Amino acid sequence: KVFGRCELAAAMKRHGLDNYRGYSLGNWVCAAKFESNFNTQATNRNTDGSTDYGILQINSRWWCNDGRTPGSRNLCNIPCSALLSSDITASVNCAKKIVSDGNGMNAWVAWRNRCKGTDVQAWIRGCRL
Numbered sequence: 187k188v189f190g191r192c193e194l195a196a197a198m199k200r201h202g203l204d205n206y207r208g209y210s211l212g213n214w215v216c217a218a219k220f221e222s223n224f225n226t227q228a229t230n231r232n233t234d235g236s237t238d239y240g241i242l243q244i245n246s247r248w249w250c251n252d253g254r255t256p257g258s259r260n261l262c263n264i265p266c267s268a269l270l271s272s273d274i275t276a277s278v279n280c281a282k283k284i285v286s287d288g289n290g291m292n293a294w295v296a297w298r299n300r301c302k303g304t305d306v307q308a309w310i311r312g313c314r315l
């Protein structure tokens with residue numbers, strides 16, 4: 187599923203990511219935009235053999251199990267396939283644990299390089315929320 191901008195903002199608010207650990211909804215939409223282009227089925231392979239999955243592009247090195255990342259962990263305790271669902275609850279609950287792990291949203295390189303320090307509010311401007 188490829189979400190629209192206001193459509194995703196709304197789902198993320200329902201699941202509780204608005205202001206979670208201090209990050210407003212605009213940071214999360216902005217991050218999804220550049221991580222996946224709002225496509226829940228996005229996948230990308232990392233040089234070390236790990237793979238990033240779903241709308242927030244969560245990494246198998248640490249957070250989910252795909253059976254093909256030697257030595258990795260599965261801290262969210264889910265198959266990476268569940269991060270590809272048209273329902274975003276698995277991606278949202280794993281993101282919650284990730285952003286609380288010490289470094290905040292700096293765990294998403296793209297948030298760091300393309301959203302951090304920008305008018306993120308413009309990503310929810312206009313939306314019936």
Ligand SMILES: [Cl-]
Nearest residue numbers: 210211212307
């Ligand atoms: Cl915002």
Ligand SMILES: [Cl-]
Nearest residue numbers: 295296299300
């Ligand atoms: Cl980047």
